[PDB]
């Protein structure tokens, strides 16, 4: 006998054993007499149109697929709960944090960044870590990564970056020349690249990695006072990674190493959990902060800004039907309950538009009416009507315009957002030449040891070696801007691999 | 105090008087603070992206519309029940007819044919009459008209025929020459054209007309014995028409005369009723029938085949939301429960493919999971999976392939189809030159009185005058082929209209 | 012998007499043997799946329809050129205004607001007047109306306003309680309501009405200096209106009166033309303006701001296919060539988002590659790829990421936008009670004569008649704020309409 | 200096050196001023909506993906020509076979079956070999595999087979119980399974395998005489296979081994080619044939029916843009030019519906107007109009109905199909118990040698060992029904693999 993943159908049969099998019907609910044989004229004659059983099944098979996620396609899923363990009501007035002990249902999806639906799991890439909270004040979507930082700091570059990471427009192959030519021309990627090419680029499953909000957010309390914050949900199972040697073996042996691994864990009772922290910065402290506090390529050092604990995330349930429950998941950074708000972070600004837009394409205009996406612990009432695939009462015979004298839904004045003062020329400001190396230098010298740095340069050199010599020499000097020995250690490796 | 239609919002406020208004939220359930004023920089400044209240409200408004029905676009809807009053179980084994007294829920839609969503109700056109029966053996959809016959008798001419009835491909106008250029080249339409331009072309609302299944269908009883049948469903309110004089006046004064009429009736307790009847033809009678028993341009005379009563359809409930309940209604002739089966009628065979096809475009692949389209009085179980906008559990983790050794749904042998024998060359057989005049001649001479024949020709000449003269005299020729006196009473008038 | 429109088919045959008719083919180009008869087993036997001729045609008929426009569904189109008559290079650097004599191809669409694809033309409602310019600096879309003003001055009320102008969500009938409940609660609409119920509410065709850009826009010259402006294109054919008597007869007699007229004009050589003017306001003149200069409910008086002529608009070409060239037209206010830019107008800012979004839904993601929508007078080169229905080379094997060291397209610094300084709070400012009556007080007393004031109230009283007494008393009070005698007239008519 | 594929961008810039790079523009053709920095209020302020450069780009990045193919999603592409070398005009009157030396433009797509977009190329599975011929009488799609047979022989079992080959609906993992439970319950798969698990399961790229039409097809010559046939493509590069050991290594070392191998071949001039053969069987010989001649699980032995040469397929051009030219390719078996027609093959009859159906969803209703899908060597003229994304003149102001008196396209009587007559009860005939063993026993004993049979069982036993014991015993028994030793060899390995 085998692992719980392999016995899915086995267990389905026994969990039903007492009952008789159900009647096999068409999509209109009409029972079928034969579904192994086609309706023809004579044993060796042509098929008939009158066979509406054949058409109904085949027509639905033809439309099984939907457009896959533009990024983060390869994914695993689970469900669970969030429990508050410490009081942070002085910072936020959000209902999700109201009192210690309070539980709220969650949903989580894991993913890579570049690989398609059929791609391998154990490859060097950032990891997706999206969490949906089902609160009474509507859903809260915290769409984070396994890294506190990202490769760029302007939303106009995101389409570009992605194109550089995927397949050549002509040959449809992954192209090292595309990969590093973007990175070498944009040194602000030197922070996140350094993260990606040492040990934590390939995590040993999804349960042995941390998760970060990365972006700075705003918190607002009852008194109407505001602060900025970071989110860090760290693993209780502890950080554990794969070696380059055997992570490559799993790519062919078991492409879904993580997918299987997550499912197996929950089914055998070992429910994975994470501990949620925040960091806090006042508007005054934002004014004296050395770098831009909304530069996504920057962290807040722990010395200057310690972690404040909030609660635990626990996943304790596997999905029943993957497509209906994990593939149709939609997370929107714009989904924020009263008390939590976005900062002027340029990269976060761009995510407010981009996500709701693509969902309307990928899933459909009424994608928020799908069960897993629905805000089922809140009362949705508005003046929105109609759209393709409307599934509920459509809010009945209620008036559909505002304002009105007929007692349709009303505003809630308390739920107004925070007021900030801004001024300056409305202009495209140059952020390409913000500090690209300081926090990177710190990472290299202070955080890594002598062999981790040695392994770090091997992993880069093993990937950069395929680019053109002008790209190589351009990238090396970018690495030299962090540390002379760092650039030179990479360069020593490249010189022999170029024969 | 005004008519019940107009006092919809007045009544909605009364039903809610005790309650206080709901919290206005986004689609993702977050309450909005202010939804009358925009988020800007300064009192006379620009708009921000950080306003997600605006973006998601506007984006949903953008996508309100779905493609209208390709035909029968303008529509009215109601709900009620089907009640069995007589026993016809010797003919059929369908659960909808299992015993006297039994009630079944129904859904009805009334419509014109050509006009678009904004067209007038009171125009000369056929009238759609669709009934959906929610049986325990799945949904049964009886999709009929207010005429026992149609304009053509082969499926390949349908798209063509429709185009001719709609708008010119360059000018986007109604074009008389198109209409009659088609009708004169296909003389089989004489029968349905003669019906259309009589008094019953323009009925006084939807409650004052009969319904007809038109097609020949098959009935099967428990023993496996089969008969052919027509469905005749007559009004209890009695036939009542509008003159062309007041029909033209109502066209501008009230574009939705029928729509209001139906709603007002149901709201005031004035429930509309029609009786269902059948005509039966044995397989033996079919072979000796002087005409083609499956010709959609032919009727079965009452003398040789009297009417057998079955039951009552009553409408007693108005829709709560028009879009969700009436505009998303789907009817499929292919939805046929055991006991009811198709005949070889050329036209009906085409409609098995067409309707499931078009609905997957208009509404979506998973359109059958829409409440009003859902078979809620049956259990759907099969091996169909995924597709955009999947709305239930997706049948859980149940095995998705057949056959299987894991007790997934099984076929029911009881539900096999009636087996018939056939012979002939597989080829395209010409139906142009079946008898096109005889049944028309009796209608003119035997059924109509002297005054009705006069108006019939006035109405044609009043419409045919707008075509070219070479088209006119070819159409006139067809009218003489029915009867010499018929043809030239029309011809005498056209020559008047030609100055 | 009849109008040129009705003789569309007649001409087509004459234009092709010398040629032989084409071979009738499937969509895939395969020649059809017979397309009047279905492939069946024996003369009275069932249809075959093997009939691939049938399916191909039948399936495309099923998907003929696309979602109609959410607003301004009923439309008419034409084509022509714009020609410059005076030099205003001192105000704008846009190449469309480079020198006197320069022509640019245009595309125009006329439309109503509320009516659907099948509605009447001769009805009281605003009239759309969108113009597309095909410049070398990309497409410019000026999407204006036949009025200088609108009903509301914040885009958050637009979805709500439209709902009130359309059909009730339950009854699917037009309801005057919805109309006047909205209008009476929002007295800022007093100005545009006065315009609509005046003589110019029902224009005599599309050739006898003015057109306005309505919004304040920003012009920029070669030195970098900027000014604000309004766009007026006044009729050369003259203003002419229809009586309430004449408009109502036409509603049923000719629903497409506007579509027929415009087509007949161009076809017969009688080409309609407009003269394009602008108003100019400096940044200085903007600060001292008594009202808000970007308020869409406000006009700029001609005495203080005279009209400066630019050029002529001529329509000289009918569309070849309505659907391909007029119904698939898409206009984006966001389409602005260097030299023309948006003001901070609250209503205009919303339209920058709304239009490109809705077109991706209505038509598709690649709606800009449809021939009539394409910028064919510019060379399109960027880092955008793929999408459903990709129609060109897809920009070949060019690098798809930016920046790059492989000489893909570069940004043009000349096309940088004008930099403005703003300051103030970031919140939602209340704009509901800016001066709503003064300019309306001017319209009533100064522009109209005593006879036109009499008819104005009559048109108002005849439609306000249908509302509830409490909505009536609210509306009259709002009108009384404009002028006491104006308010007292309307109610004086209502006391006679209430028996 | 590297391989040609990786130097694609390098070559692209060299091909342009003389030219200056283009100006980077929006989709509307408007030049952009900067596309590296956003439009904000101050250096650390919020984003504005009036920035339409961001939205236009971001909204198109959001819609880049379309649904992948329901099967055969992973792909590679190339183009070339078909050249006739022998005369087969006595069998077919098709223009593609008119005379020796005749060229036709072709398009070819290679693929696996089960794997999604991102999966590895070198895996055990059937391989797709679709060819699209661009003829004068429309496009011919000969959609074939690398195997003469298939796993099933009824069109109602196809969805079920596919579901069993792909991912479990709960765990989203590949499931051996799903795979073999099916195969064991349908013993007809014994023939194709035996092929799959042999050497020719894993081909050494796409250049070293044969391709087969599998289905029996109909050929009709100029006289109207008819015969049945098979299509065979044999490689001119020779059959060549990978060991499972090397195919596993490449799975992680090179996920796109096949795709690049093809591209590198063409680019270096080394063009791949295949030789087209046919088998022929007269109406006389078909009735005396030992098995069913339209059984997709059966071959025609070469002893009785030898190969007849036709021509050569040559690939000498790579795609320029993969997505526009390979991802949007659509092959329809229903696309057949006069002279080629379907047999009554139950499976082929079903493929006549499925492929046009799925494309309407995947790509869109007008998917044939896409360049690569378009029949650009024939003239498409018909009475099909409108539909989403209409891209040409839409056939102008031509009459849109048939028949008509206005010289619109006419049927071509010469292109009527061959007429056969069939008889027998119209009923659902059981196909489960046709001979499942004879031809398999042949393949095992005659074609394989000692060493290949030895590996065949090893390759089977290596996969079947992961299924349950009740399934193993059921599968082995089906292998025993082929040959005692064949069953016995498998069970000998299973006993060791079961510890
Ligand atoms: N301050 C921050 O929020 C983070 C900082 N860093 C890096 O550390 C530097 C110093 O930060 P500071 O807070 O002042 O000092 P600390 O020494 O307190 O920061 C240590 C942090 O480094 C993380 N870390 C350790 N090894 C790796 C690795 N191989 N890849 C990625 N992260 C790793 C640890 O994660 P864990 O706690 O799980 O052991 C821990 O959060 C920064 O310049 C930055 O580059 C890294 C992560 C976050």
Q: Residue C55 is inside which H or E element, if any?
A: helix C52-62
Residue D364 Cα to ligand 1 middle (Å): 49
- Would you call D23 helix, strand, or coil by DSSP? strand
Closest CA–CA distance from residue D496 to any residue of chain B (Å): 26
For chain D, how far is it from start to end, CA to CA, in angstroms? Answer: 52
Residue A216 Cα to ligand 1 middle (Å): 17
Residue C37 Cα to ligand 1 middle (Å): 76
Distance CA B209, CA B456 (A): 19
Q: Do B292 and C427 touch (CB under 8 A)?
A: no
Residue of A nearest to D426 (CA): A41
Which atom in ligand 1 lies closest to the alpha carbon of residue A302? 13
Looking at the partner chain, which of D50, D357, D423 has a beta carbon nearest the beta carbon of B46? Answer: D50
Closest CA to A130 of A115, A114, A119, A146: A146
Chain-centre distance for alpha carbon B342:
18
Q: Which two tokens stand for residue B461?
A: 């000449």
Rg (CA), chain B: 26
Closest CA–CA distance from residue B195 to any residue of chain A (Å): 30
Residue A447 Cα to ligand 1 middle (Å): 7
Rg (CA), chain A: 26
- Would you call C432 helix, strand, or coil by DSSP? coil
Q: Has A198 been labeled as part of a binding site?
A: yes
Q: Which residues of C are catalytic?
A: 72, 145
Contact present, C390 and D328 (Cβ < 8 Å):
yes
Contact present, A346 and D38 (Cβ < 8 Å):
yes
User: Ligand 1: which of A297, A298, A447, A483 to mutate, judged by most atoms within 8 Å of the beta carbon?
Assistant: A447
DSSP D170-230: TT-SB-HHHHHHHHHH-GGGHHHHHHHTSGGGSBSSSSS--EE--S-EEEE-TTS-EEEEE
Q: Has D200 been labeled as part of a binding site?
A: yes
Specify which residues D132 forms β-bridges with. D107, D141
CA distances for D213 relative to D128, D233, D278, angstroms: 10, 9, 10
Nearest CA to ligand 1 atom 45: A443
- Would you call A19 helix, strand, or coil by DSSP? coil
Q: Which residues of A are catalytic?
A: 72, 145
Distance CA A286, CA B116 (A): 60
* Cis before A403 (ω within 30): yes
Q: Has A383 been labeled as part of a binding site?
A: no
Contact present, B82 and B104 (Cβ < 8 Å):
yes
Work out the angle at residue D88's Cα, subtended by the Cα atoms of residues D84 and D89, and round it to the nearest 5 degrees: 110
Looking at the partner chain, which of C35, C332, C352 has a beta carbon nearest the beta carbon of D411? Answer: C35
**On the CB side of B221, how many CA atoms lie within 13 Å of its CA?**
10
Residue of B nearest to D167 (CA): B400
Contact present, D476 and D461 (Cβ < 8 Å):
no
**What are the structural domains of chain B?**
1-65 (4.10.91.20), 66-149+201-374 (2.40.180.10), 150-200+436-499 (1.20.1370.60)
Closest CA to B51 of C349, A411, A213, C215: C349
Chain-centre distance for alpha carbon C22:
39
Q: Which residues of B are catalytic?
A: 72, 145
Distance CA C120, CA C258 (A): 9
Which atom in ligand 1 lies closest to the alpha carbon of residue A452? 29
CA distances for A344 relative to A213, A429, C437, D43, D47, angstroms: 15, 14, 40, 10, 8
Q: Which two tokens stand for residue A400?
A: 């559909």
Q: Has A200 been labeled as part of a binding site?
A: yes
**Looking at residue D47, what DSSP letter applies?**
B
Distance CA A195, CA C18 (A): 75
Distance CA B440, CA B447 (A): 10
Looking at the partner chain, which of B21, B26, B357 has a beta carbon nearest the beta carbon of A410? Answer: B21
Distance CA D372, CA D363 (A): 13
The dihedral region occupied by A40, where left means phi > 0, alpha psi between -120 and 50, and beta the remainder, is beta
Q: Is the dihedral of CA B36, B42, B46, B48 positive or negative?
A: negative
Chain-centre distance for alpha carbon D377:
23
Q: Show which subunits contact B, needing at least 3 CB pairs below 8 angstroms.
A: A, C, D
Angle between helices B346-362 and C52-62 (to 10 degrees): 40
The torsion angle over the Cα atoms of residues C395, C399, C404 and C405, rounded to 10 degrees, is: -100
Q: What are phi and psi of A66, to 5 degrees?
A: -120, 165
The dihedral region occupied by C395, where left means phi > 0, alpha psi between -120 and 50, and beta the remainder, is left
Position of tokens 């999966």?
A: D119
- For the stretch B473-478, contacts whose Cβ atoms lie closer than 8 Å and that sit 24 or more positions apart, written own/partner, are B474/B184, B475/B180, B475/B183, B475/B184, B477/B184, B478/B184, B478/B187, B478/B190
CA distances for D165 relative to A30, D168, D174, angstroms: 28, 9, 8
Q: Which two tokens stand for residue D433?
A: 């118990």
Number of residues that make up chain B: 499
Residue of B nearest to D171 (CA): B397
C-D Cβ pairs (cutoff 8 Å, strict): 332
Q: Has D166 been labeled as part of a binding site?
A: no
Q: Which two tokens stand for residue A114?
A: 């570049």
CB atoms within 10 A of CB D234: 16
Distance CA D31, CA D24 (A): 6
Looking at the partner chain, which of D163, D383, D421 has a beta carbon nearest the beta carbon of B400? Answer: D163
Distance CA D481, CA D461 (A): 17
Q: Which two tokens stand for residue D315?
A: 């690939």
CA distances for D155 relative to B214, B442, D161, D435, angstroms: 33, 49, 10, 19
Instruction: Report the relative pairing of strands D40-41 and C226-235 from DSSP bridges.
Output: unpaired
Distance CA C331, CA C333 (A): 7
Q: Which residues of D are catalytic?
A: 72, 145
Residue A302 Cα to ligand 1 middle (Å): 8
Contact present, B310 and B280 (Cβ < 8 Å):
no
Distance CA B240, CA B250 (A): 16
Nearest CA to ligand 1 atom 23: A447
What residues line ligand 1, using a CB cutoff of 6 Å?
A: A 148, 195, 198-200, 210, 234, 239, 299-303, 439, 442-443, 447
Work out the angle at residue B118's Cα, subtended by the Cα atoms of residues B113 and B120, and round it to the nearest 5 degrees: 65
Question: For the stretch C198-215, what's the b/e string if a residue is b when 16 or more beta carbons lie within 10 angstroms of its beta carbon?
Answer: bbbbbbbbbbbbbbbbbb
Q: Do D334 and C409 touch (CB under 8 A)?
A: no
Closest CA–CA distance from residue A329 to any residue of chain C (Å): 21
Q: Do A344 and D118 touch (CB under 8 A)?
A: no
DSSP C373-406: TS-TTS---SS----SS--S--STT---SSS-SS
Specify which residues B79 forms β-bridges with. B107, B317
Among B38, B49, B66, B467, the residue to mutate for chain D (most D Cβ within 10 A): B49
| Cβ within 8 Å of residue C66, ≥6 positions away | B67, C327, C362, C363, D386, D387, D388
Q: Do B33 and A414 touch (CB under 8 A)?
A: yes
| Cβ within 8 Å of residue B231, ≥6 positions away | B142, B144, B211, B212, B213, B217, B276, B277, B278
Q: Which two tokens stand for residue C103?
A: 């022509």
Distance CA A174, CA A176 (A): 7
Closest CA–CA distance from residue B137 to any residue of chain D (Å): 21
Which atom in ligand 1 lies closest to the alpha carbon of residue A198? 29
* Cis before C403 (ω within 30): yes
Q: Do D396 and B170 touch (CB under 8 A)?
A: yes
Helix, strand, coil proportions of chain A in percent (round to 5)? 30, 20, 50
Contact present, B39 and A396 (Cβ < 8 Å):
no
Q: According to the entry, how was the structure determined?
A: electron diffraction
- Would you call D456 helix, strand, or coil by DSSP? helix
- Would you call A421 helix, strand, or coil by DSSP? strand
CB atoms within 10 A of CB D407: 19
Q: Has C483 been labeled as part of a binding site?
A: no
**On the CB side of A331, how many CA atoms lie within 13 Å of its CA?**
22
**Looking at residue D410, what DSSP letter applies?**
B
* Cis before D332 (ω within 30): no
Distance CA C207, CA C215 (A): 22
Position of tokens 């210690």?
A: A100
Distance CA B172, CA C323 (A): 9
Annotated binding site of B: 191, 195, 198, 200, 210, 212, 234, 300, 302, 355, 439, 442-443
Residue A231 Cα to ligand 1 middle (Å): 14
Q: What are phi and psi of D89, to 5 degrees?
A: -85, -10
Q: Do A56 and B356 touch (CB under 8 A)?
A: yes
Instruction: Report the relative pairing of strands C420-428 and C340-342 from DSSP bridges.
Output: unpaired
Closest CA to A172 of D242, D142, C402, D121: D121
Closest CA–CA distance from residue C158 to any residue of chain A (Å): 10
Q: Is D69 exposed, middle or buried (0-12, 13-18, 19+ CB in 10 A)?
A: buried
Q: Which two tokens stand for residue C450?
A: 């005593």
**Looking at residue D95, what DSSP letter applies?**
G
| Cβ within 8 Å of residue A451, ≥6 positions away | none
Instruction: Report the relative pairing of strands C226-235 and C211-212 from DSSP bridges.
Output: antiparallel
Distance CA B309, CA B85 (A): 8
Closest CA–CA distance from residue A345 to any residue of chain B (Å): 11
Among D52, D169, D417, the residue to mutate for chain B (most B Cβ within 10 A): D169
Instruction: Report the relative pairing of strands B273-282 and B308-317 from DSSP bridges.
Output: antiparallel
Distance CA B429, CA A438 (A): 84
Instruction: Report the relative pairing of strands D138-145 and D128-135 from DSSP bridges.
Output: antiparallel
- Would you call D12 helix, strand, or coil by DSSP? helix
Q: Do A421 and C421 touch (CB under 8 A)?
A: no
Which atom in ligand 1 lies closest to the alpha carbon of residue A303? 14
**On the CB side of D487, how many CA atoms lie within 13 Å of its CA?**
15
List CB contacts (< 8 A) between C116 and chain B.
116-118
Q: What is the three-state SS of chain B?
A: CCCCCCCHHHHHHHCCCCCCCCECECCCCCECCCCCCCEEECCCCCEECCCHHHHHHHHHHHCCCCCCCCCCCCEEEEEEEEEECCCCCCCCCCHHHCCCCCEEEEEEEEECCCCCCCCCCCCCCCCEEEEEEEECCEEEEEEEECCCCCCCCCHHHHHHHHHHHCECCCCCCECHHHHHHHHHHCHHHHHHHHHHCCHHHCECCCCCCCEECCCCEEEECCCCCEEEEEEEEEECCCCCECCHHHHHHHHHHCCCHHHHHHHHHHHCCCCCEEEEEEEEEEHHHHHHCCCCCCCCCCCCCCCCCCCEEEEEEEEEECCCCHHHHHHCCCCCCCCCCCCEEECCCHHHHHHHHHHHHHHHHHCCCCHHHCHHHCCCCCCCCCCCCCCCCCCCCCCCCCCCCCCCCCCCCECCHHHCCCCEEEEEEEEECCCCCCCCCHHHHHHHHHHCCHHHHHHHHHHHHHHHCCCCHHHHHHHHHHHHHHCHHHHHHHHHHHHHHCC
Distance CA A155, CA A160 (A): 10
Distance CA A352, CA D48 (A): 12
List CB contacts (< 8 A) between D175 and chain B.
none
Q: Do B318 and C170 touch (CB under 8 A)?
A: yes
Contact present, B383 and B403 (Cβ < 8 Å):
no
Distance CA A86, CA A307 (A): 12
DSSP A258-285: HHHHHHHHHHTT---EEEEEEEEE-HHH
The beta-strand segments (E) located in D318-390 are 340-342
**Looking at residue A404, what DSSP letter applies?**
-
Closest CA to B477 of B487, B462, B465: B487
Looking at the partner chain, which of B16, B356, B369 has a beta carbon nearest the beta carbon of A407? Answer: B16
Distance CA B455, CA B465 (A): 15
- Would you call D354 helix, strand, or coil by DSSP? helix
Q: Do A361 and C357 touch (CB under 8 A)?
A: no
Distance CA C314, CA C145 (A): 18
Looking at the partner chain, which of D181, D182, D419 has a beta carbon nearest the beta carbon of B427? Answer: D419
Q: Is A425 exposed, middle or buried (0-12, 13-18, 19+ CB in 10 A)?
A: middle
Q: Which two tokens stand for residue A193?
A: 């690249």
Q: Which two tokens stand for residue A122?
A: 């154990």
Distance CA C197, CA C367 (A): 37
Contact present, A472 and A464 (Cβ < 8 Å):
yes
């Amino acid at each position: 006998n085998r692992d719980p993943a392999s016995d899915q159908m086995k267990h389905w049969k026994e969990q039903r054993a007492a009952q008789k099998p159900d009647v096999l019907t068409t999509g209109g609910g009409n029972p079928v007499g034969d579904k192994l044989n086609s309706l023809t004229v004579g044993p060796r004659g042509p098929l008939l149109v009158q066979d509406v059983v054949f058409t109904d099944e085949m027509a639905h098979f033809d439309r099984e697929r939907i457009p896959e996620r533009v990024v983060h396609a390869k994914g695993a899923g689970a469900f669970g709960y969030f429990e508050v363990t410490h009081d942070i009501t002085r910072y936020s007035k959000a209902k999700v944090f109201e009192h210690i002990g309070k539980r709220t249902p969650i949903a989580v999806r894991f993913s890579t960044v570049a690989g398609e639906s059929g791609s391998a799991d154990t490859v060097r890439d950032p990891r997706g870590f999206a969490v949906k909270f089902y609160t009474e004040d509507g859903n809260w979507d915290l769409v984070g990564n396994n890294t506190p930082i990202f490769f760029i700091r302007d939303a106009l570059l995101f389409p570009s970056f992605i194109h550089s990471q995927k397949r050549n427009p002509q040959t449809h192959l992954k192209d090292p020349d595309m990969v590093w030519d973007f990175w070498s021309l944009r040194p602000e990627s030197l922070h996140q690249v350094s993260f990606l090419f040492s040990d934590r680029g390939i995590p040993d499953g999804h349960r042995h990695m941390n998760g970060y909000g990365s972006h700075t957010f705003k918190l607002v309390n009852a008194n109407g006072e505001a602060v900025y914050c970071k989110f860090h949900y760290k693993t209780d199972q502890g950080i554990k990674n794969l070696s380059v040697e055997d992570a490559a073996r799993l790519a062919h042996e078991d492409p879904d190493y993580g997918l299987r691994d997550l499912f197996n864990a929950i089914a055998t009772g070992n429910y994975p959990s994470w501990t949620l922290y925040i960091q806090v910065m006042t508007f005054s402290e934002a004014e004296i902060f050395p770098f831009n506090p909304f530069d996504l390529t920057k962290v807040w050092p722990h010395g200057d800004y310690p972690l404040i604990p909030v609660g635990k995330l626990v996943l304790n349930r596997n999905p029943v039907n993957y497509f209906a429950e994990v593939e149709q998941l939609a997370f929107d950074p714009s989904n924020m309950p009263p008390g939590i708000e976005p900062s002027p972070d340029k990269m976060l600004q761009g995510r407010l538009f981009a996500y709701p837009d693509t969902h309307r394409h990928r899933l459909g205009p009424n994608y928020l009416q799908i069960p897993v996406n629905c805000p089922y612990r809140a009362r949705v009432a508005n003046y929105q009507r109609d759209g393709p695939m409307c599934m509920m009462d459509n809010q009945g015979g209620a008036p559909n315009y505002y304002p009105n004298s007929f007692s349709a839904p009303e505003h809630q004045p308390s739920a107004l957002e925070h007021r900030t003062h801004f001024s300056g020329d409305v202009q495209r400001f140059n952020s390409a030449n913000d500090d690209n190396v300081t926090q990177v230098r710190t990472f290299y010298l202070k955080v890594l040891n002598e062999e981790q740095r040695k392994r770090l340069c091997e992993n880069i050199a093993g990937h950069l070696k395929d680019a053109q010599l002008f790209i190589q020499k351009k990238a090396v000097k970018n690495f030299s801007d962090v540390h002379p020995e760092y650039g030179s250690r990479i360069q020593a490796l490249l010189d022999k691999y170029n024969e």
